[PDB]
Structures are given as structure tokens and as C-alpha cells.
Amino acid sequence: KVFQWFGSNESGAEFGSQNLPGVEGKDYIWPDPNTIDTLISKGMNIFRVPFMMERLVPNSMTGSPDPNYLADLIATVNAITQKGAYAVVDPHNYGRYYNSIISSPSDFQTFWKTVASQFASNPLVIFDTNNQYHDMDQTLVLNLNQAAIDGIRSAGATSQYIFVEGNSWTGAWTWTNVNDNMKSLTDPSDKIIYEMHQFLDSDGSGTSATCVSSTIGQERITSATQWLRANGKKGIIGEFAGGANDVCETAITGMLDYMAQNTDVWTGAIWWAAGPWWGDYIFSMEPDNGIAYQQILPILTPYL
Numbered sequence: 001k002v003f004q005w006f007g008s009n010e011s012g013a014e015f016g017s018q019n020l021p022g023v024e025g026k027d028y029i030w031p032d033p034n035t036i037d038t039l040i041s042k043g044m045n046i047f048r049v050p051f052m053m054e055r056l057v058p059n060s061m062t063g064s065p066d067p068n069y070l071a072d073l074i075a076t077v078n079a080i081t082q083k084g085a086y087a088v089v090d091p092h093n094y095g096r097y098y099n100s101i102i103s104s105p106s107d108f109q110t111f112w113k114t115v116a117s118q119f120a121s122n123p124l125v126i127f128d129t130n131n132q133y134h135d136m137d138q139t140l141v142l143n144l145n146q147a148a149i150d151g152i153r154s155a156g157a158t159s160q161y162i163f164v165e166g167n168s169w170t171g172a173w174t175w176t177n178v179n180d181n182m183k184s185l186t187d188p189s190d191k192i193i194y195e196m197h198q199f200l201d202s203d204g205s206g207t208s209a210t211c212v213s214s215t216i217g218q219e220r221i222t223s224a225t226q227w228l229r230a231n232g233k234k235g236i237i238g239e240f241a242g243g244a245n246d247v248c249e250t251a252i253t254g255m256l257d258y259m260a261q262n263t264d265v266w267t268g269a270i271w272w273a274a275g276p277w278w279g280d281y282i283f284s285m286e287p288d289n290g291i292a293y294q295q296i297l298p299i300l301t302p303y304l
């Protein structure tokens with residue numbers, strides 16, 4: 001394979017986020033192991049699983065898990081790792097809990113000890129401290145990532161990689177402008193990976209199928225690449241997408257071709273997104289009829 005990791009997000013458990021706790025099968029749904037198997041057979045080896053902190057550990061993040069939501073997270077993780085692929089456990093929470101900024105590193109560390117304890121023996125689990133920190137204090141983002149690492153390792157989960165995320169929605173293109181302080185994170189296992197996201201539409205929000213230009217992806221990750229190299233760090237693109245059109249196709253392959261010549265720092269890339277409730281979503285990687293599964297996956301072949 002070209003990269004250490006190449007795969008897809010498996011979205012759904014974080015859906016309908018305005019309904020807390022919400023109802024499984026009505027507001028949210030978990031990934032389908034059968035279609036995960038199909039993506040595994042195509043050569044993908046990493047699957048990132050968004051979920052809501054409030055659904056896994058309700059009311060207070062220092063409390064006990066919700067049995068039913070945890071049982072389905074466990075089932076999803078095991079469905080991925082039993083085959084030999086990596087499962088990224090992603091509290092898809094934007095640095096916020098019940099829509100308030102998480103300002104207690106100690107509370108966050110307890111949450112992460114609770115979560116890591118469920119997976120501590122599984123070396124194919126990857127812990128992702130939180131999805132897309134944004135519009136919050138830059139020192140707090142550093143300290144939350146460090147508290148997560150401390151909680152994870154305190155649970156005896158020492159074999160696993162930890163994906164840390166930065167401010168500005170962990171964007172690659174904005175990384176050096178705001179996230180330099182993230183270089184000081186420490187891990188006794190030395191398995192920190194800096195997870196950045198990069199979309200290709202004009203404002204980088206990943207909501208339009210139109211890409212700025214055929215080179216916009218490779219352009220948007222060059223300064224992040226040099227930041228990783230200058231600081232002796234490793235990175236991954238944890239979310240990326242583009243529409244099913246010629247300009248985006250070229251932007252996607254140009255970005256991945258650049259990463260492929262910079263694997264001293266880039267460990268790989270994760271598409272946004274697959275999952276069973278995307279329907280006609282412009283970026284759906286869900287077999288067998290998602291638009292990206294049909295029209296984008298053929299151009300990802302050389303990286304599988």
C-alpha cells in the first residue's frame with residue numbers, strides 16, 4: 001500500500017445531534033458491518049466512527065456510559081478490528097459537551113479513561129481526542145488533547161495510536177496560522193498522530209461539490225506538511241472529500257500524489273464519508289450506490 005492508513009469515515013451515530021439522547025433507528029444509526037466488509041475488500045484499512053459524547057456518557061462526562069449506545073460502539077469497533085483493520089473512536093463533539101466548551105481538562109481526562117478502558121487491549125483501536133475543535137481558547141485545545149492522552153494511557157491503553165486534533169476545525173490549510181502550540185504534546189507511548197482535515201470547496205467547509213481548482217488540495221496541505229517535518233511529527237488527513245466531477249477528481253489525486261511523496265510525515269487519509277443513512281449525499285462512500293463509492297473510488301485505486 002502507498003500509505004500506512006487509507007480508508008473512510010463511517011458516519012451515522014452522531015446524526016440528528018439536536019435530539020439528545022435521541023433514539024437509535026430514528027435520530028441516528030450505527031455503521032453496517034456488511035458494507036464495511038466491502039470497503040475492506042476494496043483495500044481500505046482504517047474506519048473512523050463518529051459518535052456523540054452525550055450519547056455515550058450522558059449528563060456528566062465523568063459519569064457511567066449509556067449501556068445501549070456503548071454496546072453498539074463496541075459492536076462497531078469489533079466488527080472493524082476483527083478483520084484486521086483499524087477503528088478510530090471519534091467523539092464527534094467540536095470541543096463541546098451539551099453545547100458548552102469543555103473547560104475542565106480533569107473532567108475530559110476522566111471521560112477518556114472511561115472510554116479507553118473499554119478498548120485498552122485492542123491494538124487496532126485508534127483514539128481520536130475530539131472532532132474539529134474550533135472557536136475556543138488555543139491553550140485550552142492543547143490542554144484538552146494532553147488530558148485525553150493522559151487519561152487513555154492511564155487506563156493501560158498503551159499500544160494504540162492517538163489522533164490529536166487542532167483548532168480552526170483542525171484544518172490543514174489553517175494549521176500553521178493557529179496550532180503551533182500543539183507541537184508540545186507528550187505521549188509515553190510516542191504514538192501521537194496529528195489529524196488534520198481538508199476540504200476543497202472555496203471556504204473549506206466541505207458542503208459544496210465544487211472544488212476551487214484542480215490543484216487546491218495539494219496547495220492547501222503544503223504548509224502543514226512542512227510544519228509536521230520541521231517539528232518531527234506525523235500527520236493524517238482524517239477527513240477529505242470532493243464532488244464527483246472532473247476538477248475535483250484531479251484535485252483529489254493531486255493532493256494524494258503529493259502526500260505520497262511526503263510519507264515521512266503523512267501516514268495516510270480518510271474519506272468523508274460512508275455510512276448507511278447518507279442516501280444521495282454528494283460525498284457518500286457507502287456501497288453499493290453512494291455517489292463517491294461509484295464515481296470517486298475508481299480514482300482511489302492506486303492508493304489501496
Ligand SMILES: OC[C@H]1O[C@@H](O[C@H]2[C@H](O)[C@@H](O)[C@H](O[C@H]3[C@H](O)[C@@H](O)[C@H](O[C@H]4[C@H](O)[C@@H](O)[C@H](O[C@H]5[C@H](O)[C@@H](O)[C@H](O)O[C@@H]5CO)O[C@@H]4CO)O[C@@H]3CO)O[C@@H]2CO)[C@H](O)[C@@H](O)[C@@H]1O
Nearest residue numbers: 011014015016017025026027028205206207239277278281
Ligand atoms: O428510517 C429512516 C429514518 O430516517 C430518519 O431521518 C434521517 C434522515 O433520513 C437522514 O437524511 C438524516 O441525515 C442527516 C443527519 O441527521 C445529519 O446529522 C447529517 O449531518 C451531516 C451534514 O449533512 C454534513 O454536511 C456534515 O458534514 C459536517 C461534518 O460533520 C464535518 O466533520 C465536515 O467538516 O463536513 C461537514 C460540514 O458541514 O456531517 C453531518 C454528520 O456529521 O446530515 C444528514 C443528511 O445528509 O438523518 C435523519 C435522522 O437524524 C427519520 O427521522 C426516521 O423517522 C426514519 O425512520
